[PDB]
Design an enzyme around this catalytic site. Structure first.
Site, PDB file in Angstrom:
ATOM      1  N   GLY A  30       0.863  -1.166   0.000  1.00 51.77           N
ATOM      2  CA  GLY A  30       0.000   0.000   0.000  1.00 51.77           C
ATOM      3  C   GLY A  30       0.870   1.176   0.000  1.00 51.77           C
ATOM      4  O   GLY A  30       2.053   1.046  -0.192  1.00 51.77           O
ATOM      5  N   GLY A  32       1.771   4.940   2.033  1.00 52.11           N
ATOM      6  CA  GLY A  32       1.808   5.271   3.450  1.00 52.11           C
ATOM      7  C   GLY A  32       2.583   6.535   3.709  1.00 52.11           C
ATOM      8  O   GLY A  32       3.823   6.512   3.716  1.00 52.11           O
ATOM      9  N   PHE A  34       4.389   9.420   2.852  1.00 51.24           N
ATOM     10  CA  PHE A  34       5.386   9.873   1.878  1.00 51.24           C
ATOM     11  C   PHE A  34       6.237   8.673   1.436  1.00 51.24           C
ATOM     12  O   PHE A  34       7.446   8.767   1.322  1.00 51.24           O
ATOM     13  CB  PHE A  34       6.255  10.971   2.527  1.00 51.24           C
ATOM     14  CG  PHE A  34       5.445  12.100   3.073  1.00 51.24           C
ATOM     15  CD1 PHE A  34       4.798  11.968   4.302  1.00 51.24           C
ATOM     16  CD2 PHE A  34       5.240  13.253   2.322  1.00 51.24           C
ATOM     17  CE1 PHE A  34       3.992  12.979   4.793  1.00 51.24           C
ATOM     18  CE2 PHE A  34       4.430  14.266   2.807  1.00 51.24           C
ATOM     19  CZ  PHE A  34       3.812  14.130   4.049  1.00 51.24           C
ATOM     20  N   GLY A  35       5.585   7.551   1.170  1.00 46.74           N
ATOM     21  CA  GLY A  35       6.268   6.348   0.719  1.00 46.74           C
ATOM     22  C   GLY A  35       5.342   5.208   0.323  1.00 46.74           C
ATOM     23  O   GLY A  35       4.104   5.285   0.459  1.00 46.74           O
ATOM     24  N   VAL A  36       5.953   4.184  -0.245  1.00 54.13           N
ATOM     25  CA  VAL A  36       5.262   3.011  -0.713  1.00 54.13           C
ATOM     26  C   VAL A  36       5.773   1.916   0.239  1.00 54.13           C
ATOM     27  O   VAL A  36       6.965   1.875   0.550  1.00 54.13           O
ATOM     28  CB  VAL A  36       5.613   2.721  -2.182  1.00 54.13           C
ATOM     29  CG1 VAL A  36       4.928   1.463  -2.639  1.00 54.13           C
ATOM     30  CG2 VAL A  36       5.194   3.883  -3.093  1.00 54.13           C
ATOM     31  N   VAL A  37       4.882   1.053   0.683  1.00 51.07           N
ATOM     32  CA  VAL A  37       5.249  -0.052   1.577  1.00 51.07           C
ATOM     33  C   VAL A  37       5.232  -1.319   0.795  1.00 51.07           C
ATOM     34  O   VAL A  37       4.219  -1.658   0.202  1.00 51.07           O
ATOM     35  CB  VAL A  37       4.316  -0.081   2.809  1.00 51.07           C
ATOM     36  CG1 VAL A  37       4.618  -1.288   3.742  1.00 51.07           C
ATOM     37  CG2 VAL A  37       4.493   1.252   3.561  1.00 51.07           C
ATOM     38  N   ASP A 144      -1.763  11.991  12.961  1.00 47.78           N
ATOM     39  CA  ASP A 144      -2.445  11.427  11.842  1.00 47.78           C
ATOM     40  C   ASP A 144      -3.020  10.057  12.228  1.00 47.78           C
ATOM     41  O   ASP A 144      -2.845   9.092  11.533  1.00 47.78           O
ATOM     42  CB  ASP A 144      -1.492  11.396  10.605  1.00 47.78           C
ATOM     43  CG  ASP A 144      -2.225  11.247   9.297  1.00 47.78           C
ATOM     44  OD1 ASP A 144      -3.452  11.478   9.193  1.00 47.78           O
ATOM     45  OD2 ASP A 144      -1.549  10.914   8.320  1.00 47.78           O
ATOM     46  N   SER A 147      -7.758   5.018  10.496  1.00 47.59           N
ATOM     47  CA  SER A 147      -7.863   3.559  10.340  1.00 47.59           C
ATOM     48  C   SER A 147      -6.789   2.976   9.412  1.00 47.59           C
ATOM     49  O   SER A 147      -6.315   1.863   9.655  1.00 47.59           O
ATOM     50  CB  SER A 147      -9.271   3.212   9.981  1.00 47.59           C
ATOM     51  OG  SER A 147      -9.554   3.743   8.709  1.00 47.59           O
ATOM     52  N   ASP A 162       3.223   4.989  11.580  1.00 45.88           N
ATOM     53  CA  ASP A 162       3.586   6.231  10.925  1.00 45.88           C
ATOM     54  C   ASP A 162       3.885   7.361  11.920  1.00 45.88           C
ATOM     55  O   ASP A 162       2.958   8.058  12.363  1.00 45.88           O
ATOM     56  CB  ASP A 162       2.540   6.678   9.897  1.00 45.88           C
ATOM     57  CG  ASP A 162       3.141   7.663   8.872  1.00 45.88           C
ATOM     58  OD1 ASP A 162       4.220   8.183   9.140  1.00 45.88           O
ATOM     59  OD2 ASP A 162       2.568   7.896   7.812  1.00 45.88           O
TER      60      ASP A 162
HETATM   61  O1  LIG Z   1       2.821  -4.992   7.253  1.00 45.12           O
HETATM   62  C1  LIG Z   1       2.607  -3.778   7.101  1.00 45.12           C
HETATM   63  N1  LIG Z   1       1.668  -3.183   6.326  1.00 45.12           N
HETATM   64  C2  LIG Z   1       0.716  -3.795   5.542  1.00 45.12           C
HETATM   65  C3  LIG Z   1       0.453  -5.153   5.504  1.00 45.12           C
HETATM   66  C4  LIG Z   1      -0.513  -5.608   4.714  1.00 45.12           C
HETATM   67  N2  LIG Z   1      -0.889  -6.846   4.512  1.00 45.12           N
HETATM   68  C5  LIG Z   1      -1.970  -6.840   3.721  1.00 45.12           C
HETATM   69  N3  LIG Z   1      -2.585  -7.938   3.289  1.00 45.12           N
HETATM   70  C6  LIG Z   1      -2.060  -9.269   3.710  1.00 45.12           C
HETATM   71  C7  LIG Z   1      -3.316 -10.206   3.940  1.00 45.12           C
HETATM   72  O2  LIG Z   1      -4.532  -9.892   3.231  1.00 45.12           O
HETATM   73  C8  LIG Z   1      -4.858  -8.580   2.596  1.00 45.12           C
HETATM   74  C9  LIG Z   1      -3.634  -7.819   2.200  1.00 45.12           C
HETATM   75  O3  LIG Z   1      -2.240  -5.592   3.282  1.00 45.12           O
HETATM   76  C10 LIG Z   1      -1.315  -4.769   3.955  1.00 45.12           C
HETATM   77  C11 LIG Z   1      -1.140  -3.433   3.975  1.00 45.12           C
HETATM   78  C12 LIG Z   1      -0.147  -2.918   4.815  1.00 45.12           C
HETATM   79  N4  LIG Z   1      -0.042  -1.556   4.781  1.00 45.12           N
HETATM   80  C13 LIG Z   1      -1.208  -0.772   5.295  1.00 45.12           C
HETATM   81  C14 LIG Z   1      -0.944   0.694   5.441  1.00 45.12           C
HETATM   82  C15 LIG Z   1      -0.334   1.177   4.116  1.00 45.12           C
HETATM   83  C16 LIG Z   1       0.991   0.472   3.944  1.00 45.12           C
HETATM   84  C17 LIG Z   1       0.778  -0.974   3.751  1.00 45.12           C
HETATM   85  C18 LIG Z   1       3.327  -2.794   7.849  1.00 45.12           C
HETATM   86  C19 LIG Z   1       4.097  -3.160   8.914  1.00 45.12           C
HETATM   87  C20 LIG Z   1       4.779  -2.236   9.690  1.00 45.12           C
HETATM   88  C21 LIG Z   1       4.669  -0.912   9.333  1.00 45.12           C
HETATM   89  C22 LIG Z   1       3.874  -0.545   8.251  1.00 45.12           C
HETATM   90  C23 LIG Z   1       3.759   0.810   7.949  1.00 45.12           C
HETATM   91  C24 LIG Z   1       4.815   1.718   8.200  1.00 45.12           C
HETATM   92  N5  LIG Z   1       4.648   3.110   7.959  1.00 45.12           N
HETATM   93  C25 LIG Z   1       3.472   3.504   7.457  1.00 45.12           C
HETATM   94  N6  LIG Z   1       3.062   4.728   7.128  1.00 45.12           N
HETATM   95  C26 LIG Z   1       1.809   4.674   6.710  1.00 45.12           C
HETATM   96  C27 LIG Z   1       1.426   3.386   6.755  1.00 45.12           C
HETATM   97  C28 LIG Z   1       2.460   2.640   7.222  1.00 45.12           C
HETATM   98  C29 LIG Z   1       2.566   1.325   7.439  1.00 45.12           C
HETATM   99  N7  LIG Z   1       3.217  -1.499   7.559  1.00 45.12           N
END
Ligand SMILES: O=C(Nc1cc2nc(N3CCOCC3)oc2cc1N1CCCCC1)c1cccc(-c2cnc3[nH]ccc3c2)n1
Length: 288
Positions: A30, A32, A34-37, A144, A147, A162
């Site tokens: 996704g 997030g 100012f970046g792409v995760v 910020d 959900s 974030d």
């Molecule tokens: O594992 C992370 N994010 C993530 C995992 C996802 N997994 C799933 N699925 C797996 C099972 O079924 C449906 C799809 O979708 C996910 C989406 C995320 N994110 C959600 C917030 C936007 C970034 C990616 C994660 C872990 C630790 C930090 C972050 C993170 C770090 N900095 C961020 N800033 C804004 C958002 C954001 C998110 N993200």
């Protein structure tokens, strides 16, 4: 402390930062702030790799702040930084993977996931409050809360994410207004920086959890979810008209109790909102 990764490693482990969505064969999970995760796979561990993408010095400050907040703040209701990369002209942050994605996405049942039960929604609300409490006890303001920023692990434990824009701490003002307008308190929208504004945004998140609706929807009336509070207070509607229908274990009493917390967080006047400790105790009472 945190592992230092070289950019080459993180390229290799993300299919060279394959920006196509995971659903269509890439690694993008996704976007997030100012970046792409991206999803990565490194030494038997699935990880989340955020590659930062409006000046360079400001982006770099957000990167340094993310690192400082995470070094100081470890708690089971916050996201865990494993490492980072700063060699070259990209900046990456590497985290423990959250296998159930965002609360936003689980509320909308994105990709066909089953609807969250009321019992799970109550645990997520409590966890998220416990994360925000930890932050406020440590004199940080998130700025910020939404959900899309509450991630969910394999057991649906809520983790706040974030911290690039977070701030230490008497209510100051700023010229650089930040946040997400659908969630933002009146005073944040004018530039005050206060923990009371996190309380308000959490309010909106609570509405999302009750209703299953997004905070904003251009093709809906009202377009902003926080407007339902006024519809409910001006007798035009009940909380029962808006309760997510995708649950069978919600009881009126706990639903009314969570809505009562949300209503109080959403007071227009910042000094009348409960502080996080109070939100936390109310959410614990809802469940006891
Ligand atoms: O594992 C992370 N994010 C993530 C995992 C996802 N997994 C799933 N699925 C797996 C099972 O079924 C449906 C799809 O979708 C996910 C989406 C995320 N994110 C959600 C917030 C936007 C970034 C990616 C994660 C872990 C630790 C930090 C972050 C993170 C770090 N900095 C961020 N800033 C804004 C958002 C954001 C998110 N993200």
């Amino acid at each position: 402390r945190f592992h230092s990764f070289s950019f080459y490693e993180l390229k290799n482990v993300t299919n060279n930062f394959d920006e196509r969505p995971i659903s269509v064969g890439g690694n993008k999970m996704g976007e997030g702030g100012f970046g792409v995760v991206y999803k990565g796979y490194v030494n038997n561990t699935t990880v989340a790799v955020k590659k930062l993408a409006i000046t360079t010095e400001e982006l770099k400050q957000q990167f340094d702040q993310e690192i400082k907040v995470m070094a100081k703040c470890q708690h089971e209701n916050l996201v865990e930084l494993l490492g980072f990369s700063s060699d070259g002209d990209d900046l990456c942050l590497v985290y423990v993977y959250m296998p159930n994605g965002s609360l936003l996405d689980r509320l909308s049942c994105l990709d066909g996931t089953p609807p969250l039960s009321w019992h799970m929604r109550c645990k997520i609300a409590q966890g998220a409050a416990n994360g925000i409490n930890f932050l406020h006890e440590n004199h940080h303001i998130h700025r910020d809360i939404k959900s899309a920023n509450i991630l969910l692990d394999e057991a649906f434990t809520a983790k706040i994410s974030d911290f690039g824009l977070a701030r230490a701490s008497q209510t100051v003002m700023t010229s650089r207004i930040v946040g997400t307008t659908a969630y933002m308190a009146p005073e944040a929208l004018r530039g005050e920086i206060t923990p009371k504004s996190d309380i308000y945004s959490f309010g909106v998140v609570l509405l999302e959890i009750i209703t299953g609706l997004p905070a904003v929807d251009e093709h809906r009336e009202p377009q902003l979810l926080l407007d339902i509070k006024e519809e409910i207070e001006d007798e035009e509607k009940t909380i029962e008209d808006y309760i997510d229908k995708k649950m069978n274990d919600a009881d009126s009493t706990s639903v009314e109790a969570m809505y009562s917390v949300a209503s109080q967080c959403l007071h227009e006047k910042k000094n009348k909102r409960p502080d996080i400790k109070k939100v936390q105790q109310l959410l614990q009472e809802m469940t006891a």
